C-alpha cells in the first residue's frame, strides 16, 4: 500500500540514507535506510521527523509581491500574484538594473541545500548568462576556510579520507566539533569504535563543555582562538621528540611560511583593517625549509601555550603524544570551530601539518577529516562552484585556462565568463546596504537570520529602496519578511534531487510527491526565468559577433537548450515517478544538467559516475572511475589517479607534494573588554536545523527545545545576580537580543563565556555577532565576539 523510495536525509552533512513511504501524495513515514553504508539504518531525532518537515500549516503556495495601489511598491504589503506577474516584475527589475549599472549590480545568494542541478543551473545563469560573479552561498559562512585550507595544502578540495576511518582510528581528536549534536550518526560510529575497542582514545577540545564530553577520555577546554597556538605546540612536540616521519616529509611535503597581520575582513575603513599590514594579499606565502619551520614552531612551548590557552601542560602533552606516536592511527575532526574563525584557513593548514609531519594521512584510520555541515555544501556549493570566485571542480574565475574550459563546455564565446571574483556573502550584505547590489535573488537559505551583524548590514541592505529583493522559500522566514517578492518553492522529495555529503558521496532521490499549491522547485524557477533574457540584453556585442548563431536567442536557449543540457528526452524519465520540471520544459532536465556538469570533473580527479548509476545506488564516493568509487585519495593502490611506485601523490599540486605551513597565533577580531566582558559563542542544538524554519514547525522538535537560551556558568550567573530562567539582554556594540538564562543545561561554558543557539527567529542572535571574517576564505567568525549581559 505504501510506496517506499530512497533519499538522503534533508539535514546534516553526515548524509544518512533514509527510505520514505508515500501514500496519496503524502509522506507518511521515513526510516533510516538499513542498506545505506553511512548510517546502516540509524537516524537522529531530526531524521526521524522528516515526515513532518514539509507540512507546516503556513507552507508557501503562491507568489507574494509587495503591492500598493495596484503595482509593485517597496513600501507595499505582500499580496498574492501569479507566477507570470512575479516573473514580469522580476524581469523589469533585473533588466532596469542591468542597463543602468551592469552585472556587478545583480546577484544571487544560494545554498548548500540546493540540489546539485539547482546549483549548476544557477551558476550558469549568473556566470555565463548575466556575466555576474555575484553568486555566493550560505556555505561561505561554513566551508570556505576548509576549501581554502585544502587548496593551499593539497591543491584540490575535500577530504582524502572517508567514513570508514571511524572504524579504523585509535584516537579521535575533536577540534571544537560538537559531533554528538551536529553529526549524530558519525558520533555513533565514534562511540561504537571507542566502546567496542576500548584502547581507543576520544579527545574532545572545545570552548565550552557539551555532550561530546560524555564520551571523552581527555577533555580540554581552551580559550577562544588559542587553538592556533595548540596546533603549533603539537607540531613542536612532534619535532622536539624526534617523531617526524622523515621519509614521508622528504618525499611528499614542502614547507611555506604565510604572510601575517592580515586584518579581519572588515570594511576597509574599519580601524582593524587600517591597522593591518597585509590585508591586500592575505594568502601570500614564501618557500622555506624544514628547519625554518621547526624554529618557527619552537616558539610555541608549554609555558607560552599553556598560559595563552589555559590548558594544563599535562593535557597538551597527552594530546601531542597521540599525534606523535607512529603506532596510533589518529582521526582529527573539525567543524565550525576551525572554519568560522578569523584565522580558520590557517587552523585548517595547521591541523594538516600534524598529519603531514607524521605521514598519518590517506590511509584507514589516519585521517585529518574536515566535517561538512550542510547536506550539499560539498556536492553542490563546492563541487559545482556556486561562489563568487569559482568555476566547477576547484576551478577559479581568475585563471584564463579555467575560464576557457568552462566556455568550451558551455559553448560560450571566448571572454564570456567574468574574470574578477564577484561579491562574496559578507560583501553582498555590505553592497546591498550601500545600494550597489540592486537586484538580488535568495534561494534555499534564511540569510537575514543566518548572516552576522544583521542590524548594520543585512536588514538595511534588504530594505534599501534602491534594491529589489526576491526570496524563494517553502515557509515564511525573516528573510522573506525583509524581501519584496517571495516565491513559493518545492522542497526535498517534492522534486528530483542530488546531495553530496562530507565523504564525497553523491546521493540521488526521485520526486516522490507533488508540492502544494503553486509551489515550484528552485530549479524550475531558475530555468523559467532564463527565458526572459535575450543575449542582446545581457552580452556585449563583441561576444555575440564571435558566436553569431546565438543572435536573438534567449538565455534559456543558450544555457539549457544547447544540445547538451537538453539531449536526454522525456522517454528517459523513469515513468514510475513524477518529474515536474521535465514535464514543464519538455526533456529530462536534471539528467542533462548533471551530465554536462559532470564533464568538468571526469578525467580531472572529480569524476562523477553516470547519472543513472546514482538512482541505482545508495550513493557513490567520487572519483568514480570505471564504475568503482574511491574511499582514500592520494594514496597509491586506493586512488586510481596516483602514479605507481609513488606511495602517495598529492596530485592537486604540480610537484605532487603537500604543503606544511608556518603560521602564527593571531587574536580574534573582537575579544572581551571592560564594557563587554563576556565571550559570545553561537551555534546549534541537536533538535533544530539552522534558522528553525523547518524543525521548529515540527511539533515534537519545537517542544523539545522551544526557545533559544543563554547557556551560562553558574558562578557568572551569581556574579550578575541572575538565576536560571530570568530574562537578560545579550548586548554587543552592534545590537541586542533578549533570552532566558540556563545555568543547568547541556552546554556548560567556563566562566567568562556564554553560548547562544541561533535557531529561534524570535531571538535573532545575529544582531549581536560581528561580520569579521578570515581574510583568505571570507568566512565569518560567528564563534567569538564581546558582549555584556544585562537584566531586563
Amino acid at each position: 500500500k505504501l510506496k517506499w523510495s530512497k533519499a538522503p536525509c534533508r539535514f546534516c552533512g553526515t548524509g544518512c540514507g533514509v527510505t520514505v513511504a508515500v501514500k496519496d501524495n503524502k509522506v507518511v513515514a521515513t526510516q533510516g535506510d538499513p542498506q545505506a553504508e553511512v548510517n546502516k539504518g540509524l537516524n537522529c531525532v531530526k531524521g526521524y521527523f522528516l515526515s513532518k518537515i514539509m507540512y507546516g500549516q503556513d507552507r508557501l503556495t503562491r507568489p507574494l509581491m509587495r503591492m500598493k495601489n495596484g503595482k509593485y511598491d517597496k513600501n507595499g504589503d505582500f499580496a498574492p500574484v501569479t507566477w507570470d506577474q512575479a516573473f514580469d516584475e522580476m524581469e523589469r527589475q533585473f533588466k532596469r538594473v542591468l542597463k543602468e549599472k551592469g552585472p556587478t549590480a545583480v546577484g544571487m545568494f544560494g545554498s548548500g541545500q540546493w540540489t546539485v542541478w539547482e546549483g549548476y543551473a544557477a551558476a550558469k545563469l549568473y556566470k555565463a548568462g548575466f556575466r555576474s560573479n555575484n553568486i555566493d552561498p550560505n556555505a561561505r559562512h561554513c566551508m570556505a576556510s576548509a576549501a581554502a585550507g585544502f587548496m593551499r595544502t593539497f591543491g584540490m578540495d575535500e577530504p582524502m579520507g572517508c567514513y570508514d576511518d571511524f572504524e579504523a582510528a585509535d584516537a579521535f581528536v575533536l577540534w571544537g566539533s560538537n559531533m554528538a549534536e551536529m553529526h549524530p550518526i558519525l558520533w555513533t560510529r565514534v562511540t561504537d569504535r571507542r566502546l567496542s575497542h576500548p584502547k581507543t582514545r576520544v579527545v574532545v577540545l572545545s570552548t565550552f563543555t557539551h555532550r561530546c564530553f560524555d564520551l571523552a577520555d581527555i577533555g580540554i577546554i581552551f580559550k577562544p582562538q588559542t587553538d592556533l597556538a595548540m596546533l603549533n605546540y603539537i607540531a613542536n612536540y612532534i619535532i622536539r621528540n624526534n617523531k617526524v616521519n622523515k621519509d614521508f616529509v622528504n618525499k611528499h611535503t614542502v614547507f611555506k611560511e604565510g604572510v601575517t597581520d592580515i586584518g579581519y575582513g572588515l570594511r576597509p575603513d574599519h580601524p582593524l583593517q587600517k591597522a593591518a599590514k597585509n590585508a591586500s594579499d592575505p594568502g601570500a606565502a614564501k618557500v622555506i625549509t624544514f628547519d625554518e619551520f621547526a624554529k618557527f614552531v619552537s616558539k610555541y612551548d608549554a609555558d607560552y601555550v599553556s598560559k595563552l590557552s589555559a590548558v594544563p601542560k599535562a593535557k597538551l602533552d597527552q594530546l601531542a603524544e597521540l599525534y606523535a606516536d607512529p603506532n596510533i592511527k589518529v582521526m582529527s575532526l573539525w567543524t565550525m570551530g576551525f572554519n568560522q574563525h578569523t584565522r580558520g584557513t590557517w587552523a585548517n593548514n595547521m591541523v594538516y601539518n600534524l598529519h603531514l609531519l607524521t605521514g598519518k594521512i590517506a590511509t584507514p584510520g589516519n585521517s585529518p577529516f574536515s566535517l561538512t555541515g550542510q547536506p550539499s555544501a560539498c556536492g553542490t556549493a563546492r563541487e559545482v562552484g556556486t561562489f563568487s570566485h569559482r568555476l566547477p571542480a576547484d576551478m577559479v574565475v581568475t585563471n584564463p585556462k579555467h575560464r576557457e574550459e568552462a566556455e568550451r563546455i558551455w559553448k560560450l564565446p571566448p571572454g564570456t565568463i567574468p574574470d574578477k571574483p564577484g561579491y562574496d556573502a559578507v560583501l553582498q550584505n555590505r553592497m546591498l546596504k550601500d545600494g550597489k547590489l540592486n537586484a538580488y535573488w535568495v534561494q534555499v537559505n534564511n540569510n537575514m537570520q543566518a548572516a552576522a551583524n544583521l542590524m548594520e548590514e543585512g536588514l538595511p541592505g534588504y530594505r534599501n529602496p534602491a534594491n529589489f529583493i526576491v526570496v524563494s522559500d517553502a515557509y515564511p522566514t525573516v528573510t522573506a519578511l525583509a524581501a519584496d517578492l517571495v516565491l513559493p518553492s518545492a522542497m526535498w522529495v517534492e522534486k528530483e534531487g542530488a546531495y553530496g555529503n562530507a565523504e564525497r558521496r553523491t546521493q540521488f532521490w526521485h520526486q516522490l510527491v507533488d508540492a502544494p499549491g503553486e509551489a515550484r522547485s528552485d530549479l524550475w524557477q531558475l530555468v523559467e526565468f532564463a527565458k526572459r533574457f535575450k543575449v542582446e540584453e545581457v552580452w556585449p556585442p563583441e561576444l555575440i559577433a564571435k558566436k553569431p548563431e546565438y543572435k536573438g536567442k534567449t538565455l534559456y536557449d543558450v544555457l539549457y537548450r544547447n544540445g547538451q543540457v537538453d539531449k536526454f528526452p522525456l522517454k528517459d524519465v523513469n515513468a514510475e515517478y513524477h518529474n515536474a520540471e521535465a514535464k514543464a520544459f519538455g526533456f529530462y532536465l536534471q539528467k542533462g544538467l548533471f551530465e554536462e556538469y559532470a564533464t568538468f570533473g571526469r578525467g580531472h580527479g572529480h569524476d562523477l559516475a553516470p547519472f543513472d548509476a546514482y538512482h541505482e545506488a545508495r550513493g557513490l564516493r567520487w572519483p568514480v572511475v570505471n564504475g568503482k568509487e574511491t574511499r582514500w585519495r592520494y594514496r597509491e593502490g586506493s586512488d586510481p589517479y596516483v602514479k605507481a611506485g609513488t606511495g602517495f601523490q598529492f596530485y592537486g599540486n604540480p610537484d605532487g607534494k603537500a604543503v606544511i605551513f608556518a603560521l602564527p597565533y593571531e587574536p580574534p577580531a573582537e575579544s572581551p573588554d571592560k564594557e563587554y566582558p563576556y565571550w559570545l559563542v553561537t551555534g546549534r542544538v541537536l533538535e533544530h536545523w539552522h534558522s528553525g524554519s523547518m524543525t521548529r514547525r515540527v511539533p515534537e522538535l519545537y517542544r523539545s527545545f522551544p526557545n533559544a537560551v543563554v547557556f551560562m556558568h553558574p558562578e557568572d550567573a551569581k556574579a550578575l545576580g541572575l538565576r536560571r530562567g530570568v530574562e537578560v539582554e545579550v548586548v554587543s556594540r552592534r545590537g541586542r537580543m533578549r533570552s532566558r538564562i540556563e545555568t543547568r543545561g547541556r552546554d556548560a561554558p567556563p566562566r567568562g563565556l556564554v553560548f547562544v543557539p541561533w535557531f529561534d527567529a524570535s531571538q535573532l542572535i545575529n544582531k549581536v555577532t560581528l561580520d569579521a571574517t578570515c581574510p583568505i576564505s571570507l568566512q565569518t567568525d560567528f564563534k567569538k565576539c564581546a558582549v555584556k549581559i544585562v537584566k531586563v
Binding site: 513511504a21 538499513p34 507546516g56 503556513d58 519578511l481 530562567g725 530574562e727 524570535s762
Partner: protein, 108 residues
C-alpha cells in the same frame, strides 16, 4: 501580508519579550520521553536510562541491542548508548503552528 509564526508579530528590528522557560511535561518514530530527565546521568561511567529501561518501565526494544550488522548482543549496543540523540522530552506547551503530517499508524 506575510507573517513568520516562528518569530511572532515583532518587526525584525525590534526585540520581543522572551517567553518563560516551560516546564517539561510528565505524561516508526522514536517515542518522545514522557517524563522529566533533568539530572539523569548519561555518560560512559553510568547510563541512567538503562537503570529503568534495560531488557533485564517498558524495556528498550531488541533493535537497541543490535550492532551495525544486526547481530543481537547481550547488552545495549554502543550505537544506541546515547539515548538522547533520538529520544527527546517535550515542553508542556502547544506548538507554534499547525502541522499537517499523517502517521502510517493511522492510515492503514
Amino acid at each position: 501580508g506575510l507573517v513568520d509564526a516562528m518569530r511572532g508579530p515583532t518587526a525584525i528590528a525590534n526585540e520581543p519579550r522572551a517567553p518563560l522557560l516551560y516546564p517539561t511535561e510528565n505524561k516508526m518514530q522514536p517515542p518522545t520521553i514522557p517524563h522529566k530527565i533533568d539530572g539523569y546521568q548519561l555518560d560512559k561511567d553510568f547510563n541512567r536510562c538503562m537503570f529503568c529501561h534495560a531488557r533485564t518501565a517498558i524495556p528498550v526494544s531488541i533493535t537497541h541491542y543490535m550492532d551495525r550488522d544486526n547481530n543481537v548482543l547481550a547488552d545495549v549496543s554502543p550505537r544506541r548508548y546515547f539515548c538522547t540523540q533520538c529520544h527527546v522530552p517535550q515542553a508542556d506547551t502547544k506548538p507554534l503552528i499547525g502541522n499537517n503530517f499523517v502517521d502510517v499508524d493511522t492510515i492503514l
